[PDB]
Amino acid sequence: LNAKVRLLREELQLLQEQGSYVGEVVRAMDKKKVLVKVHPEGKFVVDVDKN
């Protein structure tokens, strides 16, 4: 019960942080870099998280 109460209390601060986009991947590149496309904008060359 204490754990769930603490989680509920922290949820308010957790929820305040920013959001994230959704994109479509075209094809990968060298050294952990890929090419993506976001629909109402131009395509970007981005890197990949370690996971």
């Binding site: 094809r27 904008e41 131009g42 395509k43 970007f44 060359v45 981005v46 890197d47």
Partner: protein, 384 residues
């Protein structure tokens, strides 16, 4: 890196050995020179320190943009993806040799400065008209002609395989070849055999799709086709049923009959414009040659014209021999009786009769082929 092409001795001669030894000595001395500074005055790793600095300079996101105009002193006008364009500068590690109008370039996120240049991503067209694998077996499958095969070989294969006969006499090989004759006699088959034997990139396109549904699209397509054929390598361009653009008319065409004329003028230019043509061979084929424009076939655009006549009875027997080579044919049948089944049957009727007889025997779960199968097959295929 093409250090020395003069190895023409190609043997154990002392000249080649001395040249190789001197090359090795030069390479060793230059290696010592290029290593001494990394041993005495490194001042940086220079293997990954410079790379780390470069990666630190460029941001982790970088956007694509289109060049529109470039000034010599390292800056240009780049159009962003939305469309608004700027006056950014150019860095030094961008190898300013691929800078061309229209190429996608990698810009920085903050100041939009040009940091990199990007390779393109092929085209949808190239896959559509690029032949990948050799279709089937070479001239040993044709039979019957044996005369114009040498002409085709003289035009396309010999200039590439032995480019020494011509240089001794100092001539240019004949430029164009066109094949005409009645339908169903073996033109596309000869093209397939050439495609199998050849080594250059082979491009095929039919004439019925040279006509589009908008204004000015046809000339655009022709220009793109020859641009692709030019930018690869020694190549062969094959156009089939050209007359299909002058015979049938479609209501889907936005223009009338004049845009056909515009496409024709574009094609004539591409065959014999005043630009340097390069190294491209053209093969054309049709069965109604009395309709197309005589200005399209003049010498200097098409130099060879080959007629395919109807098969003769010797060639008829040879064709029947070819097309039942692997068929479990019974001993009762005889090809002579089938030879004059029709007075003027062409090459395709032979294969049609053979395949239909095979199917009819397949129905009864059999292996051999009898006379009555052939007798009914000819009626099925010929008399409707």
């Amino acid at each position: 890196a093409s250090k020395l092409p003069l190895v023409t001795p190609h043997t154990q001669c002392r000249l080649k050995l001395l040249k190789l030894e001197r090359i090795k000595d030069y390479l060793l001395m230059e290696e010592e020179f290029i290593r001494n500074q990394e041993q005495m005055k490194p001042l940086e790793e220079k293997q990954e320190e410079e790379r780390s600095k470069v990666d630190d300079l460029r941001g982790t996101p970088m956007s694509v943009g289109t060049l529109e105009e470039i000034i010599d002193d390292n800056h240009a006008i780049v159009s962003t993806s939305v469309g608004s364009e700027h006056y950014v500068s150019i860095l030094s590690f961008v190898d300013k040799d691929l800078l061309e109008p229209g190429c996608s370039v990698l810009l920085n996120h903050k100041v939009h400065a040009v940091i990199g240049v990007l390779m393109d991503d092929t085209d949808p067209l190239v896959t559509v008209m690029k032949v990948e694998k050799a279709p089937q077996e070479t001239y040993a499958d044709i039979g019957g002609l044996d005369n114009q095969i040498q002409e085709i070989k003289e035009s396309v294969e010999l200039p590439l395989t032995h480019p020494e006969y011509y240089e001794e006499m100092g001539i240019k090989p004949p430029k164009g070849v066109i094949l005409y004759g009645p339908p169903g006699t073996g033109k596309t088959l000869l093209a397939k055999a050439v495609a199998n034997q050849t080594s250059a990139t082979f491009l095929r396109v039919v004439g019925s799709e040279l006509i589009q549904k908008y204004l000015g699209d046809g000339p655009k397509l022709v220009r793109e086709l020859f641009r692709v054929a030019e930018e690869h390598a020694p190549s062969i361009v094959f156009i089939d049923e050209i007359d299909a653009i002058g015979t049938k008319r479609y209501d889907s065409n936005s223009g009338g009959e004049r845009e056909i004329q515009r496409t024709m003028l574009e094609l004539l230019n591409q065959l014999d414009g005043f630009d340097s043509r390069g190294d491209v061979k053209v093969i054309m084929a049709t069965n109604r040659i009395e309709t197309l424009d005589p200005a399209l076939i003049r010498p200097g655009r098409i130099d060879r014209k080959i007629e395919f006549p109807l098969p003769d009875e010797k060639t008829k027997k040879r064709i029947f021999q070819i097309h039942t080579s692997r068929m479990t044919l019974a001993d009762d049948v005889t090809l002579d009786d089938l030879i004059m089944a029709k007075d003027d049957l062409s090459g395709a009727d032979i294969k049609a009769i053979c395949t239909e007889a095979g199917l009819m025997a397949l129905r009864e779960r059999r292996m051999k082929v009898t006379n009555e199968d052939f007798k009914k097959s000819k009626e099925n295929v010929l008399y409707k």
